Design an enzyme around this catalytic site. Structure first.
Site, PDB file in Angstrom:
ATOM      1  N   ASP A   7      53.612  10.323  67.899  1.00  0.00           N
ATOM      2  CA  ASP A   7      54.504  10.017  69.001  1.00  0.00           C
ATOM      3  C   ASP A   7      53.618   9.976  70.238  1.00  0.00           C
ATOM      4  OD1 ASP A   7      56.479   9.927  71.034  1.00  0.00           O
ATOM      5  OD2 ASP A   7      57.073  12.024  70.761  1.00  0.00           O
ATOM      6  N   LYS A  68      51.068   4.760  79.493  1.00  0.00           N
ATOM      7  CA  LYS A  68      52.174   4.134  78.752  1.00  0.00           C
ATOM      8  C   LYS A  68      52.984   3.181  79.668  1.00  0.00           C
ATOM      9  CE  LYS A  68      55.751   5.213  75.331  1.00  0.00           C
ATOM     10  NZ  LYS A  68      56.325   6.289  74.484  1.00  0.00           N
ATOM     11  N   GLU A 173      60.676   4.358  68.392  1.00  0.00           N
ATOM     12  CA  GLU A 173      60.923   5.792  68.566  1.00  0.00           C
ATOM     13  C   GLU A 173      62.331   6.228  68.096  1.00  0.00           C
ATOM     14  OE1 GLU A 173      59.837   6.416  72.717  1.00  0.00           O
ATOM     15  OE2 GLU A 173      57.749   5.917  72.242  1.00  0.00           O
ATOM     16  N   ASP A 197      67.504  10.378  74.095  1.00  0.00           N
ATOM     17  CA  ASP A 197      66.116  10.796  74.307  1.00  0.00           C
ATOM     18  C   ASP A 197      65.746  11.037  75.772  1.00  0.00           C
ATOM     19  OD1 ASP A 197      63.293  11.189  74.099  1.00  0.00           O
ATOM     20  OD2 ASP A 197      62.964   9.462  72.774  1.00  0.00           O
TER      21      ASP A 197
HETATM   22  N1  LIG Z   1      62.556  24.751  76.870  1.00  0.00           N
HETATM   23  C1  LIG Z   1      62.588  23.651  77.723  1.00  0.00           C
HETATM   24  N2  LIG Z   1      63.554  23.548  78.683  1.00  0.00           N
HETATM   25  C2  LIG Z   1      63.585  22.494  79.531  1.00  0.00           C
HETATM   26  N3  LIG Z   1      62.690  21.496  79.469  1.00  0.00           N
HETATM   27  C3  LIG Z   1      61.719  21.500  78.542  1.00  0.00           C
HETATM   28  C4  LIG Z   1      61.629  22.596  77.607  1.00  0.00           C
HETATM   29  N4  LIG Z   1      60.560  22.339  76.798  1.00  0.00           N
HETATM   30  C5  LIG Z   1      60.022  21.185  77.183  1.00  0.00           C
HETATM   31  N5  LIG Z   1      60.713  20.651  78.239  1.00  0.00           N
HETATM   32  C6  LIG Z   1      60.392  19.395  78.982  1.00  0.00           C
HETATM   33  O1  LIG Z   1      60.080  18.342  78.092  1.00  0.00           O
HETATM   34  C7  LIG Z   1      59.315  17.345  78.806  1.00  0.00           C
HETATM   35  C8  LIG Z   1      58.428  16.582  77.831  1.00  0.00           C
HETATM   36  O2  LIG Z   1      59.332  16.009  76.887  1.00  0.00           O
HETATM   37  P1  LIG Z   1      58.601  15.150  75.716  1.00  0.00           P
HETATM   38  O3  LIG Z   1      59.804  14.699  74.815  1.00  0.00           O
HETATM   39  O4  LIG Z   1      57.669  16.047  74.998  1.00  0.00           O
HETATM   40  O5  LIG Z   1      57.860  14.029  76.566  1.00  0.00           O
HETATM   41  P2  LIG Z   1      57.570  12.555  76.017  1.00  0.00           P
HETATM   42  O6  LIG Z   1      57.497  12.466  74.565  1.00  0.00           O
HETATM   43  O7  LIG Z   1      56.200  12.140  76.657  1.00  0.00           O
HETATM   44  N6  LIG Z   1      58.866  11.572  76.482  1.00  0.00           N
HETATM   45  P3  LIG Z   1      58.764  10.733  77.955  1.00  0.00           P
HETATM   46  O8  LIG Z   1      58.016  11.451  79.155  1.00  0.00           O
HETATM   47  O9  LIG Z   1      60.284  10.531  78.348  1.00  0.00           O
HETATM   48  O10 LIG Z   1      58.265   9.381  77.653  1.00  0.00           O
HETATM   49  C9  LIG Z   1      58.604  18.077  79.977  1.00  0.00           C
HETATM   50  O11 LIG Z   1      59.259  17.628  81.167  1.00  0.00           O
HETATM   51  C10 LIG Z   1      59.026  19.553  79.700  1.00  0.00           C
HETATM   52  O12 LIG Z   1      59.151  20.303  80.898  1.00  0.00           O
END
Ligand SMILES: Nc1ncnc2c1ncn2[C@@H]1O[C@H](COP(=O)(O)OP(=O)(O)NP(=O)(O)O)[C@@H](O)[C@H]1O
Length: 381
Positions: A7, A68, A173, A197
């Site tokens: 991912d 990205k 995704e 998502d």
């Molecule tokens: N326990 C939690 N409570 C609230 N937020 C969280 C928690 N754990 C992780 N996050 C948030 O999750 C985010 C990352 O989400 P993630 O799905 O891993 O990113 P991604 O895959 O790069 N998707 P995107 O940025 O939308 O393209 C960060 O903003 C974190 O702060």
């Protein structure tokens, strides 16, 4: 050899492997299953993930992120031109209207395509997987948002190739999340699946149809500028104003290190508020030797992001309308992205779906990688 599922997120990347005929999500060197999609260049080294993200305040011009948002796009795209205004790293026009990231690395000017930056992140995913599995890895499935065009898909595949991965397939995704839950085997006839998502920087809602193992993306909606980072911004803003009124209008934002310490603690406070009703920020000698502390409740955090959390429901309405489908027709509501861990976000979606329990057994920031790993195994034979 064995095949992995990756991912490649805007803010965080995640890799899934196969051990003992099941999927394992690969922990990084910090024991976390997700790695910041960050790279940094210095006069002596290149840093990836957490090491890159933590030194952002000390080296802003040479710390690259959000590749990205640039991958497979043209330099003159309004979206690219708009994004560039918020990036401290330099982006220039290359030949054939290709964006070029310009940094300093090992005492010289260095140019990179967005796929070369993403290749560094993919190489790190290949490394942790090799360490975890105790063997060489090349075969992979890399995921992309359902709205990605052929240019963005091909550039993501090129990032894989530059990292030494044999990219067997680029898959969507939301489809990967549906595969993770075995939604392509759940019942009889047609299955309607909604993927909700919410990650670090983006919000994607996808409506899929499954019939006899064949997936079809019917409708997609969301906001490429709505994620966990924007929620942190709201907490940071609250604390910046709270320091001003406690300290005769003093502005800590003038000091990059002080603001970074505050932002780091706002991020952790937000995460604490997903499991606790109270979070504490306590920072000694924050700005001009002045100590700072504040108690942040879940209610206060929810109040600070009230508009953002409500705005997540409009793209859910947009996908259902676009496909001419009623909310009651959805068989599975899937929670994906780290920000779906927020209790208020969960309560709002469940209320919208009239108390329907969502698919949330798989860690939401790991589901896409999990699904990509299942697909990789099928393709690997
Ligand atoms: N326990 C939690 N409570 C609230 N937020 C969280 C928690 N754990 C992780 N996050 C948030 O999750 C985010 C990352 O989400 P993630 O799905 O891993 O990113 P991604 O895959 O790069 N998707 P995107 O940025 O939308 O393209 C960060 O903003 C974190 O702060």
């Amino acid at each position: 050899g064995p095949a992995i599922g990756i991912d490649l997120g805007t803010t965080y990347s995640c890799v899934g492997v196969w051990r003992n005929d099941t999927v394992d999500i690969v922990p990084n060197d910090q024991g976390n299953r997700t790695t910041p999609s960050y790279v940094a260049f210095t006069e002596t080294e290149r840093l990836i993930g957490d090491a890159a993200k933590n030194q952002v305040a000390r080296n802003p011009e040479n710390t690259v992120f959000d590749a990205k948002r640039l991958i497979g796009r043209k330099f003159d795209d309004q979206a690219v031109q708009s994004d560039m205004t918020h990036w401290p790293f330099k982006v220039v026009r290359g030949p054939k209207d290709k964006p070029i990231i310009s940094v300093n690395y090992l005492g010289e000017k260095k140019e990179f395509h967005a796929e070369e930056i993403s290749a560094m992140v993919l190489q790190k995913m290949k490394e942790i997987s090799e360490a975890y599995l105790g063997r060489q890895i090349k075969n992979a499935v890399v995921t992309v948002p359902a709205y990605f065009n052929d240019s963005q898909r091909q550039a993501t595949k090129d990032a894989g190739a530059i990292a030494g991965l044999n990219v067997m397939r680029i898959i969507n995704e939301p489809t990967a999340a549906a595969i993770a839950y075995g939604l392509d085997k759940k019942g009889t006839g047609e299955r309607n699946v909604l993927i909700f998502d919410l990650g670090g920087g983006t919000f994607d809602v996808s409506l899929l149809t499954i019939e006899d193992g064949i997936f079809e993306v019917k409708a997609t909606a969301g906001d490429t500028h709505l994620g966990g980072e924007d929620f942190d911004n709201r907490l940071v803003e609250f604390c910046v104003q709270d320091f001003k009124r406690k300290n005769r209008g003093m502005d800590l934002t003038t000091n990059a290190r002080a603001l970074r310490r505050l932002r780091t603690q706002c991020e952790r406070a937000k995460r604490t508020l997903s499991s606790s009703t109270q979070a504490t920020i306590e920072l000694d000698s924050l700005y001009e030797g002045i100590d700072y502390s504040v108690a942040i409740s879940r209610a206060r955090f929810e109040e600070l992001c009230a508009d953002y959390f409500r705005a997540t429901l409009a793209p859910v309405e947009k996908v259902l309308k676009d496909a001419g489908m009623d909310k009651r027709s959805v068989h599975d509501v899937v929670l994906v992205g780290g920000s779906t861990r927020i209790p208020k976000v969960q309560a709002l979606i469940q209320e919208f779906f009239n108390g329907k329990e969502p698919c949330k057994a798989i860690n939401p920031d790991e589901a896409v990688a999990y699904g990509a790993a299942v697909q990789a195994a099928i393709l690997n034979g």
